[PDB]
Structure 1
Amino acid sequence: RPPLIERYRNLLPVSEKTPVISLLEGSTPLIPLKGPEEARKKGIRLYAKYEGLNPTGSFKDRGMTLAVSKAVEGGAQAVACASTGNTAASAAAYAARAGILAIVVLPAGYVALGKVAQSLVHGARIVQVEGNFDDALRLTQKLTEAFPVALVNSVNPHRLEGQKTLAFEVVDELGDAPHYHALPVGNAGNITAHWMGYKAYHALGKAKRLPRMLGFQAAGAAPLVLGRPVERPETLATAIRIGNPASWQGAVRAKEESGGVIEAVTDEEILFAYRYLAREEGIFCEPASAAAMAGVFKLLREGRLEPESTVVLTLTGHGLKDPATAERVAELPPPVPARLEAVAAAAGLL
């Protein structure tokens, strides 16, 4: 696992003066999937780029390594965001690695300790303000303008450049870009970066073809499917519970230029794919990440994937990011006497 910035140095906005703040993120496994049967019946091969195996458990590490490295190169004493999720955790981990502050501004009483616990252990400075979520974003902006603090939010150009490397790794591995590439779409910075990576590698000549990007959003938070912002987003897939994507334009360009789509999958569909990956492929990912697999199931049922094609799915986060969704009251059989036969019977071996 080389530092991501070093693996693609000549293709990234870095110089010899750029301080490489790396946790050896990237270079994640591209697991060939066994099925599903719907796909095998048509010679369609699926590969899961397992981004949950990045340092903080999310693909965001790809963008953060570059963003914090550049921030430091600029003399920044800290980075900031107004996120309560995987962004804050990634920012905090890299800030810690750099020896600088990670600042997260949020409306008081909004988040639970459990959700920001990861970023806090990394020493994140979480500032709850007595105001609205608009007050937090705003105060964040001014912090970035009055002090040496870099904003590492969704639109940070460096986060997008770093996230582009995922496409590079896929082509390096497969020998070419896949026919299709599915992934979840929240603020849409990831699908925008994926498309950037593919176009860049294509121009470089390492990728002969360009994949059709397949973006999927939860039905309850599908502004890019609906073609309008969603004021009241909702879904068990927290990572993509977004009503106004920050990289809206980037997503639409990626979709259009790649000849792809951005469609919706229901929470039931997301939950189904979530279970499928865990029980059938042995891959535990976040519900939002599962949306990508739900998306492939959807198009397979609709007969919209060409036979004999290759499909790559970016499973964005690790299942451990959201234990709650995995801890529904199990309702396990009652205990059995400490007798072997009883045990084998309970284990279903008889």
Structure 2
Amino acid sequence: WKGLIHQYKEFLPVTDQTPALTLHEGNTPLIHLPKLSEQLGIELHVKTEGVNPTGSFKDRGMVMAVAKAKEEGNDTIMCASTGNTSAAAAAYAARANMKCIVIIPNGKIAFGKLAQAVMYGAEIIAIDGNFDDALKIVRSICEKSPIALVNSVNPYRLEGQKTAAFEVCEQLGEAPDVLAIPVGNAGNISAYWKGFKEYHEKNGTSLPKMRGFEAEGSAAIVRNEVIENPETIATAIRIGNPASWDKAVKAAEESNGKIDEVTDDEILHAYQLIAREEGVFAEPGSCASIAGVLKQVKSGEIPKGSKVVAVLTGNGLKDPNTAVDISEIKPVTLPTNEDSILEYV
């Protein structure tokens, strides 16, 4: 396995002049969750994108966007980020010998992502505004500067991210009934749908129902209005004006899917559920896909017996502070005695 550009070049806008950039991204596990599957009465798998080199699915788009930006002659890339896009941008820039400038919302990106941006060598600019404010600035600057924009409005980002749908079909042996996915800036749900349509066209696989889930306090698509003050403890998807809004809606309509919302309480519960029941640790915003499966299994929007693939978009180590916060452990102190300890259990 030598990275996405090599593996899927047949589906990518790459030429012999594209730099052979890779951090061995892609090819992530599709993990069957038999306990949750039996509890829910469905066949549930998780695409664990936390295994990608910078710990999220953003690596898929970033390797494409950075390579094309280099192929186009740039020495500098820029993005706004809730943390995972900036971490991917900074790593691939470092790998590609390019400068990386990132604009992040002060106090609103997970601590692991800040460590990454710092430990990849990005020029980090923190603003008092939110992600939506940062993206507006970054797009404005890149219109007027010799700096390549690598946010998801760069179409090369979606070309890389659609490979995830290719893998899901290859790993499941068929397309799933449901692709459940978190929605922040909405590029990823759009990319998966493009991937499923291209695979349907080339290989005959069926078309999943695209089921996206915003966080309630940032569910701009669900509310059908721009959210000027989005909030959620799942700061990855704390995004109130998704730049791929229309593409996401088109993906739900064309796939007979839906973009739904889940509450923060529901997110945190799914967050603990997969770690406790299956040994799978994903960051809170990723667990919106699992909260969404729980919500729609109950309502019947996901019927029993469905083959469901939920995307866990980011590693749980991205956000140590949420895990520390909700896992209040005040361990009992016991005498050093076999009977004391065994009896307490």
Give the TM-score of the pair, scaled to structure 1: 0.91
Q: How many Å apart are 1:230 and its aligned residue? A: 1.2
Q: 1:38–1:300: 8 Å Cα contact kept in structure 2?
A: no
Deviates more, 1:309-318 or 1:98-107: 98-107
Q: How many Å apart are 1:332 and its aligned residue? A: 2.3
Q: 2:297–2:304: 8 Å Cα contact kept in structure 1?
A: no
Say which SS state the counterpart of residue 289 (structure 1) adopts.
Answer: coil
- Structure 1 residues 38 and 296: alpha-carbon distance in aligned structure 2, compared to 1, 3 A threshold: farther
- Share of identical aligned residues, percent? 53
Say which SS state the counterpart of residue 95 (structure 2) adopts.
Answer: helix
1:36 is aligned to 36
1:167 is aligned to 165
Say which SS state the counterpart of residue 148 (structure 1) adopts.
Answer: coil
Q: How many Å apart are 1:229 and its aligned residue? A: 1.3
Aligned residue identity for 1:169 = E
Q: Is residue 227 of structure 2 the alignment partner of residue 196 of structure 1?
A: no
Q: How many Å apart are 1:8 and its aligned residue? A: 0.3
Q: How many Å apart are 1:148 and its aligned residue? A: 3.2
Q: How many Å apart are 1:199 and its aligned residue? A: 0.6
Say which SS state the counterpart of residue 214 (structure 1) adopts.
Answer: strand
Deviates more, 1:228-237 or 1:280-289: 228-237
Structure 2: tracts of 5 or more residues without a match: none
Q: 2:110–2:319: 8 Å Cα contact kept in structure 1?
A: no
Once the two structures are superposed, residues 74-97 of structure 1 have per-residue CA deviations (whole angstroms, 9 ceiling, x without a partner) of 111011012241111000000000
Structure 1: tracts of 5 or more residues without a match: none
1:198-347 correspondence to structure 2 within 5 Å = 198-204=196-202, 206-328=203-325, 330-346=328-344
Query: In the comparison of the two structures, how many residue pairs are matched?
Result: 343
Q: 2:82–2:236: 8 Å Cα contact kept in structure 1?
A: no
1:100 is aligned to 98
Structure of larger gyration radius: 1
Alpha-carbon distance in structure 2 between the residues aligned to 1:232 and 1:271: 21
Deviates more, 1:268-277 or 1:109-118: 109-118
- Structure 1 residues 134 and 309: alpha-carbon distance in aligned structure 2, compared to 1, 3 A threshold: closer
Say which SS state the counterpart of residue 34 (structure 2) adopts.
Answer: coil
Once the two structures are superposed, residues 191-238 of structure 1 have per-residue CA deviations (whole angstroms, 9 ceiling, x without a partner) of 00010100111111x243100000011111111111111112111111
Aligned residue identity for 2:272 = R
- Structure 1 residues 207 and 321: alpha-carbon distance in aligned structure 2, compared to 1, 3 A threshold: farther
Once the two structures are superposed, residues 321-345 of structure 1 have per-residue CA deviations (whole angstroms, 9 ceiling, x without a partner) of 1111100262423311222222223
Once the two structures are superposed, residues 130-161 of structure 1 have per-residue CA deviations (whole angstroms, 9 ceiling, x without a partner) of 99988855663465345432100121101111
Aligned residue identity for 1:33 = L
Q: Is residue 1 of structure 2 the alignment partner of residue 4 of structure 1?
A: no
Alpha-carbon distance in structure 2 between the residues aligned to 1:7 and 1:23: 13
Q: 2:109–2:235: 8 Å Cα contact kept in structure 1?
A: no
Q: 2:40–2:297: 8 Å Cα contact kept in structure 1?
A: no
Give the TM-score of the pair, scaled to structure 2: 0.93
1:46 is aligned to 44
CA RMSD of aligned residues (A): 2.2
Aligned residue identity for 1:7 = Q
- Structure 1 residues 195 and 138: alpha-carbon distance in aligned structure 2, compared to 1, 3 A threshold: closer
Aligned residue identity for 2:234 = A
2:25 is aligned to 25
Q: 1:175–1:207: 8 Å Cα contact kept in structure 2?
A: no
- Structure 1 residues 155 and 302: alpha-carbon distance in aligned structure 2, compared to 1, 3 A threshold: same
Alpha-carbon distance in structure 2 between the residues aligned to 1:135 and 1:305: 35
Aligned residue identity for 1:155 = V
